[PDB]
Amino acid sequence: SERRRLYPPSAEYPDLRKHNNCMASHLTPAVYARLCDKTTPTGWTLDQCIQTGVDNPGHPFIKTVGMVAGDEETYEVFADLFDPVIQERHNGYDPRTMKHTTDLDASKIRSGYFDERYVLSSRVRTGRSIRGLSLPPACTRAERREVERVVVDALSGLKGDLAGRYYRLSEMTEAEQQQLIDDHFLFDKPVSPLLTAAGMARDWPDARGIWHNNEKSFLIWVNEEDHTRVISMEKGGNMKRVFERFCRGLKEVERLIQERGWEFMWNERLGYILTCPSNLGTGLRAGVHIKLPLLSKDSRFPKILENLRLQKRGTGGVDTAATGGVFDISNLDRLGKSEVELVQLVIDGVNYLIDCERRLERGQDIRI
Amino acid sequence: SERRRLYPPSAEYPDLRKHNNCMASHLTPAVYARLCDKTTPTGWTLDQCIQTGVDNPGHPFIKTVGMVAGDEETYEVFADLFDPVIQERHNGYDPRTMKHTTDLDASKIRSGYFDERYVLSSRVRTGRSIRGLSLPPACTRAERREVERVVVDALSGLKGDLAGRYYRLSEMTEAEQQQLIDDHFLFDKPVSPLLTAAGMARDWPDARGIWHNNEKSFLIWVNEEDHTRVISMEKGGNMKRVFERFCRGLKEVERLIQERGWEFMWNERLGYILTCPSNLGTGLRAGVHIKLPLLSKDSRFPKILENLRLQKRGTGGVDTAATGGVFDISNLDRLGKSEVELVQLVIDGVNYLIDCERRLERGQDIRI
Amino acid sequence: SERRRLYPPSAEYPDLRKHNNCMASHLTPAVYARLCDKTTPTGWTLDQCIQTGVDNPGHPFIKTVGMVAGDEETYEVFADLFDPVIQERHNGYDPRTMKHTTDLDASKIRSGYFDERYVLSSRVRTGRSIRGLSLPPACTRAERREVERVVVDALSGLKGDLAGRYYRLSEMTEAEQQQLIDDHFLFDKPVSPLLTAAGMARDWPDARGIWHNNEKSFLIWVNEEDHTRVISMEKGGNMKRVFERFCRGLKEVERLIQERGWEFMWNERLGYILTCPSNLGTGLRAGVHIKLPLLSKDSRFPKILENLRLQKRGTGGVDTAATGGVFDISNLDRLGKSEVELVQLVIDGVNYLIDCERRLERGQDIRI
Amino acid sequence: SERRRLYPPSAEYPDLRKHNNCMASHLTPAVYARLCDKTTPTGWTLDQCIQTGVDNPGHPFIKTVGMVAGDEETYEVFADLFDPVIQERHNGYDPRTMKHTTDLDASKIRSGYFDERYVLSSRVRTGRSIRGLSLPPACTRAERREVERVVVDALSGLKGDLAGRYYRLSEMTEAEQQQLIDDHFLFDKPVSPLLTAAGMARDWPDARGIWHNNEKSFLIWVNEEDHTRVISMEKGGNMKRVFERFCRGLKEVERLIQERGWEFMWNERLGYILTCPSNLGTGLRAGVHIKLPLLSKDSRFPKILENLRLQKRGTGGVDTAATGGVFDISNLDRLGKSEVELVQLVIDGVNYLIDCERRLERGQDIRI
Amino acid sequence: SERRRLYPPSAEYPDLRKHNNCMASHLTPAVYARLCDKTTPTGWTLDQCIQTGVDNPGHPFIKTVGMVAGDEETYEVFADLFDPVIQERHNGYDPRTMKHTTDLDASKIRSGYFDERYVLSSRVRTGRSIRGLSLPPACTRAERREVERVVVDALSGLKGDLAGRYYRLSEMTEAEQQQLIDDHFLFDKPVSPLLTAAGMARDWPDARGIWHNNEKSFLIWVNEEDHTRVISMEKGGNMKRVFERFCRGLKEVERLIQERGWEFMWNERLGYILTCPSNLGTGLRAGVHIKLPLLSKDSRFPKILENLRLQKRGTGGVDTAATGGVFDISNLDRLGKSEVELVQLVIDGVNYLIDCERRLERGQDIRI
Numbered sequence A, B, C, D, E: 001s002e003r004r005r006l007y008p009p010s011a012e013y014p015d016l017r018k019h020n021n022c023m024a025s026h027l028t029p030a031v032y033a034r035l036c037d038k039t040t041p042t043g044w045t046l047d048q049c050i051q052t053g054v055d056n057p058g059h060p061f062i063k064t065v066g067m068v069a070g071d072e073e074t075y076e077v078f079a080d081l082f083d084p085v086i087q088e089r090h091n092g093y094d095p096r097t098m099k100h101t102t103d104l105d106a107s108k109i110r111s112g113y114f115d116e117r118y119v120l121s122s123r124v125r126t127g128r129s130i131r132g133l134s135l136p137p138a139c140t141r142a143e144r145r146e147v148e149r150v151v152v153d154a155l156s157g158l159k160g161d162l163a164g165r166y167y168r169l170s171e172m173t174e175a176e177q178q179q180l181i182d183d184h185f186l187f188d189k190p191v192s193p194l195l196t197a198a199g200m201a202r203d204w205p206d207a208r209g210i211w212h213n214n215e216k217s218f219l220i221w222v223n224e225e226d227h228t229r230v231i232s233m234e235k236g237g238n239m240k241r242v243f244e245r246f247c248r249g250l251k252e253v254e255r256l257i258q259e260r261g262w263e264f265m266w267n268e269r270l271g272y273i274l275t276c277p278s279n280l281g282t283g284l285r286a287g288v289h290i291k292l293p294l295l296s297k298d299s300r301f302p303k304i305l306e307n308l309r310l311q312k313r314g315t316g317g318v319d320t321a322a323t324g325g326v327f328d329i330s331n332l333d334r335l336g337k338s339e340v341e342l343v344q345l346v347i348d349g350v351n352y353l354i355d356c357e358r359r360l361e362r363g364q365d366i367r368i
C-alpha cells in the first residue's frame, strides 16, 4: 500500500560524533535529508558516497576526504555536498565559480634537478577515467573488464621507448607481485581502508593489471583505484626528465585511447574526474622519496609542509609509516593549478626543504 | 529512491496488552504483517478496520467486536481476520464453510404475544446497505448524499398504512430531536465510542435523517450507522403484529429501492453486509423493553442471558445503563439463523425470563 | 474504464450554512474545487484538513480556526486556503509577504512581576515538531513511537536543575493521571472536540507521555497535540523567572535534539510549524491564572480582552468554563511577534487588567 | 487524487421502465454493474452497445434487439449480456453450447418457384465484415475508407455475368439516388432509428457506395449498416435462380477479398459477425414481395407469421408500412440454421401463405 | 533488474578509420554518445540514420553524404549531426541561422536554349514527401501503400496535356521495365549502394510505380527513393520549355494532392524534407546529357565542375560511368537557392562548358 511510511531521513543519519574527515565536517542533517532521495542514473546514492568516510573516522597519517564517486554524474548530482568538500580539500578553489586549466609542457619546467644525495627517487603520476563506464567503487565485473580491454588495446600501440607489455595481476605469481610492490612499481594489495570501505576491492584481482615499458620507467596501473593511473618513475633527482617522459607518454596514451572512440571523463569546472575528490583537476601527484639522514633532523616538519602545500607520506605506500627517515613528499592540491605549476611548486618546496638541512646552521624560517 | 526502507509491519503493530475485544483476541503479528499491505479498491485498509477496537479496549456494558468494514470488499479482502471474529461473535457460524439463509414469513411465528405487565414495548430492526456506495466509516459527503437521495426517492413510493414523511436531521430543532430520542424513535447523538472511533460521525448531521410513517410505527434511519435501518415499533407486547408489519414494510422498501436500479449489499456466505461484523447475516434485532418492578429481582442474570443467547442493554440505547429495572433484551446472534427463527428464539427466551420471575417461588433453572 | 465519471467537486462541498469558524468563513466553492485534487507527499488531503472545522461549527468558549495540518508540506500545498486563515487568525500578519523573527532573551523582559493577590500562577508554553515525521493528525503508530523515542533519548541528557524523568501515560495509574491533571501539569484526557474530530486521539494512550523535572517546574508533553510541548510553570506571579527557565530549558532541549541528527519543522515565512494554524510562528502561549475575588467584578471584559489581544479561557482547560472568577488569560497571537515581545505584551495586558477592576473607583478605559 | 470517488454503476443505470426491446428485457442492475468497467481493445463500452436500445423503446413495426457491436471483440467481451439476447432473438439457439454450420449449395434447394401472380419479386441478402476493422457503429473515417478501398479493389476482379461497376454515394445526384431507392436497389437515406441512435450515420455519405452488375441482379452495399451487404435480386418468383446467382457471386467475392490478405469476421460459435445481433450466423435474409390484391384478405396474420418464423416488413424497407397489401416476408432467424435450410424454410412458409391466401374456401390452419 | 548495465555508447561507436563520407567526417564520439539515446516518435534512431554511411566508405563516382532520414522529425531530433552535414553539403548554407526561399516562375528564366549539337537531352526533377507518413528508409508496407494510393488518386485529376496513366512496377513485364530504364524514363533496379544499405529496397517492387503522360514528357516516380519524384524530360537543349512544363505540372500536382487533405513535408528552415540531406531545400536537379565528341577533350574537368558547383554523373544513373564522353551534368546544391536561380546557374555553367570545348583554341579559364 502507498499509505505505508518510510524511515525519516534523520533515522538514517550517520553518527559522526567522533569522526575527523571532511565529509563528517561538512555533512549536516539538512544536506543529508535533501540528498538522501537523489541518485545517479547508474544507481549511485549518497550513502554509498559517504560510506568510506562513515566507516573510517581516523586513518592516519593524513587527513582523508571520506567520500568517493561512483560515476561522472555523482559530482553533479550530489554537488551540494561535494562542492564544499572539494573547496576545503583544494585550499579555496571554488568549483561553482572558477574553472580549471591544464597544460602539459615540461619546457616551462626549467631547472628541477634535485640533490642526488637527498632524494633517491622521483615520480610523477596522474589518473584517468573512461567516459561511460562506472568508477571502481561502483563498476561491475563487465565494466571493469571493458575498461581493461580498452586500455590494453590502446596501449598496444605504444612504440619506441614507450613500447611495453601488459601483465595481468591474476596471472603473476605471488613472488613477482611482492617483488614489484617492494620495488615501488606495482600497487599494494587491497588493504587500504579507503579501498576496502569504498568497495574498490571487489572481485580482486580480476581485471586488474600493470602495463609497463621494458625499462620500467613508464607504467600504467589498470583498475586499482582509478580506471587508469599513468606513472613515470626514475631512481634519482632528475624531475625534469621524468616529467618530460610523463608528458609525452600521457599524450600518446590519450591519442591512442581516443582513436578507438573512447573519451576521458572531463569537464572544465572540475578537470579530470576521478574517484576520490582529492584527485580532481589534474589528478597529478609529483613527488620524491627523500634521504633518511638529515631530514631525520627536522622537528617542526608539519607546519612547514602545510605552509608549502606539500603532503608527506611514509615510505612506499600512503598507508605505511616512514622508516629510517625516508619520506615520500609530494604536492597536496591538484585542482585549480596546472601540471607545470604543480611540478614547479613541488620542485620549489623540495628545494626549500633541502636548504633547511641545518646540520651546520640553526633556525627554520617556515616561510608561509 | 527505491533503496529507502519502510517501517517494518511489527513497528506499526498495535499495543493490545490490556484490550478486551474480539479483534484484540484474534489479532496476531503474523496476521497483521500479512494484511498490512492489502487494501480494498476504495482504499480501505486494515488499520482503518481495527482503529475502533484499538482505541476502545473496554466499552461496557457488552462485549464489542472492535472492527468495522469500509465497503463490501472489506469482508473479502481482510477475510483472514474477519472470519475468526465473525465465527466467535456468532457462536460458531463458519463463514468459510456454511451458508446463510433468509426467510421473512410472519405466518410461521405463531404465538408471540408477551405479558403486557412485563414488556411495555416491542421493537424489530434490520439494516441495509446500498451496493456500490462506501459504508459510513469510509463514505465521503457525496456518497452519503447519494445514499440519502436514493433512499428518500424510493421511500416516497410507500402507500397506505406505511405512507410517511422524511425528516432531515439538519432541519429539525434541538427540541424535536430530543423529544424523538427520548421517545426511543430517533437515533441518539453521535457520542457512541464505536461511532466516533470508527469515523461514522464525520460531517454530522449532514445527510442523516429519519423517515417515519404517520403512526410512527414504521421508521427508517438514514445514514446513522448503516446506510439504512428499518425499524418497526409498538408500545406493547404484541411481537406478532410488529414482525408482520416489519416484514411487509421491508419487502415494499426493497422492491421500491430495486425499482430504480439499486441493489443491496448481499452474498449468500455472509447474508446482508453491514458495517459492524456483529450485524451480518439477517442484521435483525428483535427485542422488548422489560418490566421495572420484577426483573429487578434477578441475581444470576448474565449466565441465563448468555445461555439463552440474549443480549441485555440499558434502556434508551446500548451506551446507557438500565435504570429502574427496565432492560432492552434482544437476540445476540444474527448470522446463520433466519429472521423467523431469531424472532421465535427471542420470544422463547423472553417467555423463559417471565417464567423465571418467580416472586412466589424460588430457584432458577438456568436451563442451557 | 477511463470513461467513468467522478463526483464533481461541488458534490463533495461541505454544508457550512451554520458554521462559525475561520475555515467556514474563508472556504468557497472555487477554492475547494481548486484544491480537492491536491495532496501532500504523505497523502494528506484538503478534506482531512477541514474535517475538524466541518464537524465543529461552534465550540465555545473561543473562536476556532477549524483546520489542522497533517505534515509540513500541508501549509505549502494548501496555502491558497491556509494563508487567509492564518492572516485573519493572527491579526493581519501576511505569510505570503512578510517574514517571522524569533528571539528568546530573558534579559530584555525586565519587570514582569505580577501582584500575588491577583495571579496565583504563571505559565509559558511552546510547541515543536520533528522534521520528517507526520503530525499527530496524520501520524501512524510507528511515527508516533519514533517521535517518543527521539524526544526521550534527547531529554535524557538534561542535567542539573532541569534534570528529570519521563512518565509514560500507558504506565501510570488513573489516580496519578487525575492528580497530575487536577494540578494543571498533565494534559487532559482526549475529549477536546478538535482533538477527536481532527484524529489526534487515535491509539490513545499509546506513545503519549510527560517528561518533567523533579520540582515539576519544567515539563514536556509528548504526543498530545503536537510532537512536543515545552512548558515552564510556577505557582506565583514571577513571570520573569518562569520565562528565564523556559528559555534556557528550550535552548538545551533544542541542542540535545539536534545532536542526534533531528531538526525541528521551521521556515522563516511561518516560523515553527505546528498542527493548529493558531500556534504557528513562535507557538508561544504565556499566561496566568487570576484571583477569584477581584476580576469577577468585570462587566465589559470581552471588548477589553480583544483590544489587548488577550485570550480568556476558563480555569485549567480551554474546553472548561471559568469557575469562581478565575480566568486563564494569555496572548492571542503567536505569529509575527517574537517571544520577548509576546511575553511583554502579556505582562502589559495583565497589568492593565489589574489596574482596571476597581472596587474603589469606577469607569473602564478599554484603551484600544 | 486517488481518494476521489466515481459515480456508482447504479447511478448510470438506464431508465427502462417503458422499453420494449430485448436489451431492456435482459438487462439487470447486476449485469450492468458487472460489465460497466469492461471495454473492447478499440474502446467500445457497454453504454455504446445499449445506446440504441435505450433511446428506442418502441420502433414499429417489428421487435428490435436494441443492441449493436462496435467490433469483433464485443460479442466476447460483453457475452454475459449478448448471449441471452442472441438466444432469445434466434428462437433458442445457445451460443455458449452449440455451434453454427454454413453451407451454400444451390443444388439441394430444389423447387423454389413461387406463383408469379403473388410474389412479383424475390431477393436474397447477406452481410460481411472485414476482420481487423471496426464496425460501422464505431468505425472512424479512416477505417471506413479502408473498408471501401478493400471492397472496391476486390470487386474489380469480378468477371463475366457478375462484372459490374462501383458508384460512390457522394458522387451521384439526388435524382439518381432517389430512383435507385424507389427501385428497391439502393439503401435508404440515413433515417432509420437504429442507424441514427447507434451512430452508423456519422460522416454520411462519405465512403458509402453501391457496386452493382450491369443487369443489376447482383449488388453490394458498401458501408451502410455492415461493411458489405451482398444482394441478389430478381423480379418474379424464381427463388432458385436468385439463390444460385447469390451463392456463386458470394463465393467469388469471398475469394477475391481473401486474395489480398483480408479475411472476414467469423467464429464457429456465432458464424459471421455483424453489427446487429439479429444478423449473426449466416446473416442471410431471403424474402419476397407479395401480392397486393389477395394477401390484404388475411386477418390472423401475425400468429401465422410467428409460427412460421417469418418476419413481415413493409414494402420499401423495414421502417416503412405495407401499402396496398404488398408485404416483404422473409425468414426471422439467421443463426443456427444453414443458408440452404433458411431458403427452404422461406419457400415453405411462402407456399403455405399462398395456399392459405386462396379465399375460395374458409378456415386458416395456423399449423405451428 | 535495474542494476544491469548497458553497453557504453563508445562500445557501439562505428569504426570509420577509412571512410570518406560527410557523416564520417562530422561524427565524433561526443556527438554519438549524446544522440545515441534519442529517437524520433516513429522509432528512428541515430544508428539507422548513419547505417548507409557506415556501410559505404567509398561509393564512386561522387562524394556521398552517408546519412538518411526516417521521417520529418529526424532532421529536428538529430539536428546536432545533420546541421553540420547539411552546411558542408550545401556550400555554406546554415540551417540553424538562415531560411530557405522557393519560387517556381518560368518567366524570369529567359534564354536557356543550349546548343543542340552538344546536349541531346534536358531534364528537371524534384522530390516530395507526404506529411504524416514515414520516409522510404523507415516506411512499412502499409505506409508505402498509403503513399501510393494518395499519389495515384491525386494524379488521376491531371487533365489536358498533363493527362497520363499510372503503371505499377509489379504489373509490368521485365522487357517493359528494361525498355523504360534504357530510355532514361524509369528508375533503375534496386542496386544502388545507398538504396540497399539505407533499407529503401524492402518489399521491392511492392507499391512502387511510374505515372507518366502520353508524350512521356511528364513523369512521376512513386516510392523509389522519395515518396514522389516529379520529372520533366525532353530530348534537346530546350531547357526553358522543360522548366515551364515542370513548373505548371508541379503546381497542379501539389494542388490536387492538397485537395484531399494531404500536405507535403516542409519547413522554412530546410525547405522540402526528403530522405537524403543532399536533396533538401528545393530538391531540384536540373541537368543535361552532354555531347560525346568534344567534351571528351576536357582535361582539368573536375576543378571546373567544382568551381561551377556542377556535379557530373556518368550516363543514365549516378551509379554508372560515363560511356563515350556523354555526361549528366547538373547542379550540385539544392538548398539556399530558389528553383529559378538553380536552373539559371545550370544554364550558365553548361554554356561555360560549351564555350570551353576549345576544339579550335587553347586554354581553360577555370573561372571560379
Ligand SMILES: Nc1ncnc2c1ncn2[C@@H]1O[C@H](COP(=O)(O)OP(=O)(O)O)[C@@H](O)[C@H]1O
Binding pocket: A121, A122, A123, A125, A181, A183, A184, A185, A186, A187, A188, A285, A287, A288, A289, A313, A315, A316, A317, A318, A319, A328
Ligand atoms: N617518489 C617515489 N619514488 C618511488 N616510489 C614511489 C614514489 N612515490 C610513490 N611511490 C610508490 O607508489 C606506490 C603507491 O603510493 P600511493 O601512496 O598509493 O601514491 P598514489 O597516491 O599515487 O596512490 C607505493 O608502493 C610507492 O612505492
Ligand SMILES: Nc1ncnc2c1ncn2[C@@H]1O[C@H](COP(=O)(O)OP(=O)(O)O)[C@@H](O)[C@H]1O
Binding pocket: B121, B122, B123, B125, B181, B183, B184, B185, B186, B187, B188, B233, B285, B287, B288, B289, B313, B315, B316, B317, B318, B319, B328
Ligand atoms: N424494545 C424497544 N423498545 C423501545 N425502544 C427501543 C427498543 N429497542 C431499542 N430501542 C431504542 O433504540 C434506540 C437505539 O438503540 P440501539 O441499542 O442503538 O439499537 P441498535 O441495536 O439498532 O443500534 C434507543 O433510543 C432505544 O430506546
Ligand SMILES: Nc1ncnc2c1ncn2[C@@H]1O[C@H](COP(=O)(O)OP(=O)(O)O)[C@@H](O)[C@H]1O
Binding pocket: C121, C122, C123, C125, C181, C183, C184, C185, C186, C187, C188, C233, C285, C287, C288, C289, C313, C315, C316, C317, C318, C319, C328
Ligand atoms: N496560567 C496557568 N497556570 C497553571 N496551569 C495552566 C495555566 N495555563 C494553562 N494551564 C494548564 O494547561 C492545561 C491545558 O491548557 P490548554 O488550554 O490546553 O493550554 P494549551 O493551549 O497550552 O494546550 C490545563 O490543564 C491547565 O491546568
Ligand SMILES: Nc1ncnc2c1ncn2[C@@H]1O[C@H](COP(=O)(O)OP(=O)(O)O)[C@@H](O)[C@H]1O
Binding pocket: D121, D122, D123, D125, D181, D183, D184, D185, D186, D187, D188, D233, D285, D287, D288, D289, D313, D315, D316, D317, D318, D319, D328
Ligand atoms: N423481395 C424483395 N423485392 C424487392 N426489394 C426488396 C425485397 N426485399 C427487400 N427489398 C429492398 O431492400 C431495401 C432495404 O430493405 P431492409 O428492410 O433495409 O432490408 P435489410 O434489413 O436487409 O437492410 C428496401 O428498399 C426494399 O425495397
Ligand SMILES: Nc1ncnc2c1ncn2[C@@H]1O[C@H](COP(=O)(O)OP(=O)(O)O)[C@@H](O)[C@H]1O
Binding pocket: E121, E122, E123, E125, E181, E183, E184, E185, E186, E187, E188, E233, E285, E287, E288, E289, E313, E315, E316, E317, E318, E319, E328
Ligand atoms: N539529362 C538527362 N537526360 C535524360 N535522362 C536523365 C538525365 N538526367 C538523369 N536522367 C535519368 O535519370 C535516371 C536516374 O538518374 P539519377 O542519377 O538517379 O538522378 P536522380 O538524382 O534524379 O535520381 C537515369 O536512368 C537517367 O537516365
Ligand SMILES: CN(CC(=O)O)C(=N)N
Binding pocket: A063, A064, A065, A066, A194, A276, A278, A318
Ligand atoms: C588516501 N586517499 C584518500 C584521500 O586522499 O583522502 C586516497 N584517495 N588515496
Ligand SMILES: CN(CC(=O)O)C(=N)N
Binding pocket: B063, B064, B065, B066, B194, B276, B278, B318
Ligand atoms: C455497540 N456496537 C458494537 C458491537 O456490536 O460490537 C454496535 N455495533 N452497535
Ligand SMILES: CN(CC(=O)O)C(=N)N
Binding pocket: C063, C064, C065, C066, C194, C276, C278, C318
Ligand atoms: C482550542 N484549539 C483550537 C484553536 O486554537 O482554534 C486548539 N488548537 N487548542
Ligand SMILES: CN(CC(=O)O)C(=N)N
Binding pocket: D063, D064, D065, D066, D194, D276, D278, D318
Ligand atoms: C431493424 N433492425 C434492428 C433489429 O433487427 O432488431 C435492423 N438491424 N435492421
Ligand SMILES: CN(CC(=O)O)C(=N)N
Binding pocket: E063, E064, E065, E066, E194, E276, E278, E318
Ligand atoms: C547518390 N545519392 C547519395 C548522395 O546524394 O549523397 C543519392 N542520394 N542519390
Ligand SMILES: [Mg+2]
Binding pocket: A225, A318
Ligand atoms: Mg594509492
Ligand SMILES: [Mg+2]
Binding pocket: B225, B318
Ligand atoms: Mg444503535
Ligand SMILES: [Mg+2]
Binding pocket: C225, C318
Ligand atoms: Mg491544549
Ligand SMILES: [Mg+2]
Binding pocket: D225, D318
Ligand atoms: Mg436495412
Ligand SMILES: [Mg+2]
Binding pocket: E225, E318
Ligand atoms: Mg536516383
